[PDB]
Amino acid sequence: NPDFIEALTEKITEEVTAKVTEELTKQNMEFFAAVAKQSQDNFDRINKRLEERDEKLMSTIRLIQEQ
Amino acid sequence: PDFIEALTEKITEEVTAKVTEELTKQNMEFFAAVAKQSQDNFDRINKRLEERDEKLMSTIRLIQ
Amino acid sequence: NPDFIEALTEKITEEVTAKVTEELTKQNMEFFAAVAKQSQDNFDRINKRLEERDEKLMSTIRLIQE
Amino acid sequence: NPDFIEALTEKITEEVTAKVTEELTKQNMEFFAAVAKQSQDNFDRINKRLEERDEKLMSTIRLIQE
């Protein structure tokens, strides 16, 4: 019967699909989390740069003024 | 053979067609999200640099 | 017998794999190429905007002087 | 022949799954690495620009007004 062929194929297609897409999902999650981490670390580094720069600037403005 | 040929060709097309599709669909959704957090990140930086430069100048002028 | 099963299995396995990877590769090529253009485009914006704020800045430090 | 069909069904599913997962894994590592490096190369890009910006802005104010 082509019913038996259709059926056996779909069983195999489903199992292979399920277990392939499950693994590729887990790998994509891990990559998403790690890129976010990367992004925050990047933002934090930048916001420190701005803090130091704003401070050094205001310090220098202050020294100009006191003259 | 007619059977084994039929089953073999069937399994191959079917697994290939459906795996490609399911990963593709899944990729479109991932590549969309990764591009958004990417642009969100740029929007974040931009807005922060805009604001701090505006505060720098408004400082400078106002103090001098 | 098993050799035959084993042979059908290596054939199916390789036909599928080659087709799937040849697909997820071409896909990853597009996305890579697109995140690069987005990355550079976003760099060009931030740079212009810094130029514009350096000009405003010099204009200001030029007036404070006058 | 149930034993033959069974035998063939098991091996195809194990092997196709094993072979595909492994290739995509391999493709993904190579692929993820290149997103991640392009990403940090872009962040470095911004950083060295802000370092140089802030440094020039600093030098101007001190040279002009101090």
Numbering used by the authors:
A (entry chain C): 110 to 176
B (entry chain D): 111 to 174
C (entry chain A), D (entry chain B): 110 to 175
From the paper:
Here, I report the crystal structure of the TubY C-terminal coiled-coil domain of the pXO1-like plasmid pBc10987 from Bacillus cereus. Sequence analyses revealed that BcYN and BcYCΔ contain the HTH motif and coiled-coil domains, respectively. I determined the crystal structure of BcYCΔ. The asymmetric unit contains four BcYCΔ monomers, which forms a tetrameric four-helix bundle with dimensions 90 Å × 20 Å × 20 Å. These four monomers are parallel and related by a pseudo-2-fold axis, and the root-mean-square deviation (rmsd) of Cα atoms (residues 112–174 of chain A and B versus C and D) is 0.37 Å. The BcYCΔ structure reveals that the hydrophobic core of the four-helix bundle is mostly aliphatic. Regarding BcY, BcYN is monomeric and incapable of binding to DNA, whereas BcYC is a tetrameric parallel coiled-coil with no cysteine or histidine residues. The crystal structure of the BcY C terminus revealed that the coiled-coil region is a parallel tetramerization domain, demonstrating that BcY is a unique tetrameric MerR-like transcriptional regulator. The results of this study show that oligomerization enables efficient binding of BcY to DNA. GFP-BcYtail was not localized to the cell periphery, indicating that a single BcYtail peptide is not sufficient for the membrane attachment, and that tetramerization by the BcYCΔ region increases the affinity of BcYtail for lipid membranes.
More importantly, TubY modulates the interaction between the segrosome and the TubZ filaments; however, it remains unclear how TubY is involved in plasmid segregation. TubY, a putative MerR family protein, is considered to be an integral element of plasmid partitioning in type III par systems. This study shows that B. cereus TubY is a novel membrane-binding transcription factor and segrosome component by binding to the TubR-centromere complex, suggesting that the cell membrane is involved in the process of type III systems.
